[PDB]
């Protein structure tokens, strides 16, 4: 019974860590975009449209 609970909770934790890694990749992409906007719009004048 404890083995059943262990594999269920381990599957839940692996699912949580996997979706956290996917959201971390999305947030890292957004933060790289934000650093690019910090460099190009604040620290200079950008010719790039929109």
């Amino acid at each position: 019974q404890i083995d059943r609970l262990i594999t269920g909770r381990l599957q839940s934790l692996q699912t949580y860590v996997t979706q956290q890694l996917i959201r971390a990749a999305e947030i890292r992409a957004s933060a790289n975009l934000a650093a690019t906007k910090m460099s190009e719009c604040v620290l200079g004048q950008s010719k790039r449209v929109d």
Binding site: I2, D3, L5, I6, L10, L13, Q14, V17, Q20, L21, A24, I27, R28, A31, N32, A34, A35, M38, S39, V42, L43, G44, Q45
Partner: protein, 120 residues
């Protein structure tokens, strides 16, 4: 705290180590993201005490000296509008230091143009 559960969990190997290492990588990646976004200057600039900018007003974006958090009114409104083995690690940069970084960036882009981003 069940020792029999941990004895059975040791049969599965280093799954817990992989989960902890992935979460540690995410946790340091968030601090790296904040470091790349806000810490683009190594000089902390300040505006002059006299705000004579030829009619241009920056009081809504410059930090308010009356507030203890040293935030701008816009930044204060932005911070007001956002509302079992589990631990929450604090971010490496506090909100006061992120506000200080944005204040330095604002002072640089107001007083010095784009010259501070390319050199002195």
């Amino acid at each position: 705290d069940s020792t029999e559960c941990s004895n059975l969990l040791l049969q599965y190997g280093s799954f817990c180590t992989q989960l902890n290492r992935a979460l540690t990588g995410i946790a340091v990646e968030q601090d790296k993201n904040t470091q790349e976004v806000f810490a683009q200057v190594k000089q902390i600039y300040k505006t002059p005490p006299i705000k004579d900018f030829g009619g241009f007003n920056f009081s809504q974006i410059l930090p308010d000296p009356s507030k203890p958090s040293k935030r701008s009114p816009i930044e204060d409104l932005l911070f007001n509008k956002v509302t079992n083995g589990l631990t929450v690690l604090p971010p490496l940069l506090t909100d006061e230091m992120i506000a200080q970084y944005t204040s330095a960036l604002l002072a640089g882009t107001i007083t010095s143009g784009w010259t501070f981003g390319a050199g002195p």
